[PDB]
Amino acid sequence: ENAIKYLGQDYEQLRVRCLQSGTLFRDEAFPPVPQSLGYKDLGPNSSKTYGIKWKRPTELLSNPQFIVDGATRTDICQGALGDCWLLAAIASLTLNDTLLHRVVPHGQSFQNGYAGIFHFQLWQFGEWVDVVVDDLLPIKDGKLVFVHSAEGNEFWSALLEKAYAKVNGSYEALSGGSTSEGFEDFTGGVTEWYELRKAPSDLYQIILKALERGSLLGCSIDISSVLDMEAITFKKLVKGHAYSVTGAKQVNYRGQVVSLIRMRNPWGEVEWTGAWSDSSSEWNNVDPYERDQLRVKMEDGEFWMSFRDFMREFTRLEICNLTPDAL
Numbered sequence: 001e002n003a004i005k006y007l008g009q010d011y012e013q014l015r016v017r018c019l020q021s022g023t024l025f026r027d028e029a030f031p032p033v034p035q036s037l038g039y040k041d042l043g044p045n046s047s048k049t050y051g052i053k054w055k056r057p058t059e060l061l062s063n064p065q066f067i068v069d070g071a072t073r074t075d076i077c078q079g080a081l082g083d084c085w086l087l088a089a090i091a092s093l094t095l096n097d098t099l100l101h102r103v104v105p106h107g108q109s110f111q112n113g114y115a116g117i118f119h120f121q122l123w124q125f126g127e128w129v130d131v132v133v134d135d136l137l138p139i140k141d142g143k144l145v146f147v148h149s150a151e152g153n154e155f156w157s158a159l160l161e162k163a164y165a166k167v168n169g170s171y172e173a174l175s176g177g178s179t180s181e182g183f184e185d186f187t188g189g190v191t192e193w194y195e196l197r198k199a200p201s202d203l204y205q206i207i208l209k210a211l212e213r214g215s216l217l218g219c220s221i222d223i224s225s226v227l228d229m230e231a232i233t234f235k236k237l238v239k240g241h242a243y244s245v246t247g248a249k250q251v252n253y254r255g256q257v258v259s260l261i262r263m264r265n266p267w268g269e270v271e272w273t274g275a276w277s278d279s280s281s282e283w284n285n286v287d288p289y290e291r292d293q294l295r296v297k298m299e300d301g302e303f304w305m306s307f308r309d310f311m312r313e314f315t316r317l318e319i320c321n322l323t324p325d326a327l
Ligand SMILES: *[C@@](O)(C(=O)NC1CC1)[C@H](C[C@@H]1CCCNC1=O)NC(=O)[C@H](CC1CCCCC1)NC(=O)c1cc2ccccc2o1
Pocket: 078, 081, 082, 083, 084, 085, 175, 176, 177, 178, 179, 220, 221, 229, 230, 240, 241, 242, 316
């Protein structure tokens, strides 16, 4: 019920100590040094680390905020790191309000009570643990190098990504991964995998129920070989790339009931251009209320597809349920 302290570090104790001492926390466990960034691609002498510096948000802007207009999936915009699986897990997590509020302790701020330390809860090896970080973040050309919010002064997702790097020993360790790991590390649940070509006839209903329960869902397109990793298709889907599944709804359309599914590219941009895409003409033949409820004309990485097209274009689905045997 109460989280174990990762590496014995006590968030409240350290915060109060720094606050009374008039100093900012510096994390001995995960210091702002090259090793923290990485070892090969992000290694000490890699050109990928050119110009990277470590700065706290308070050393960057005037009024840095932890959470702005809520901690939501639009705050998850991938940086220069191969951790799409993890960022898709975070975006999916934001749809489960209870779990989101466990992983991200709200009420942390850069104002009252600030001592340069933040904390997060992660499910690790069968137990919840509390991971602290200092708020030094990798910056290049004045901007965050890795994950960032669409809101430039919002830092909760950057700090959560840093905490996850910390438990993995470096940012580079997060490059290339499996969405199921992030889902489970944020929920304590277990993921079931679906091969779309061989799915049960009621997969759409399974997806609806799972989204309703607050389960976490993701999807992806298989790669044919190494060199079509991250290939962008003609209709602007990305292969070998973790997407969050963020919604589903049936609408009346041309005399039939059509099932739609909504998903989000953790890039926060580059979307499907086919039927039910933000600017597609299908929305012209949908009820004006349902159109207003579902359709958002915004280059934000999130878009709708018909379930038929979803089944045609994507290859895999993952569903991470918290209590799969007790619904
Ligand atoms: C994401 O698409 C991503 O982060 N994209 C932004 C960088 C542009 C990554 C890209 C991947 C990262 C490593 C370097 N080159 C790449 O193409 N894609 C993955 O991480 C991919 C996601 C999974 C999610 C669920 C099934 C589909 C694929 N996973 C891997 O590439 C991967 C996973 C894994 C597990 C163990 C060992 C290696 C390994 O690689």
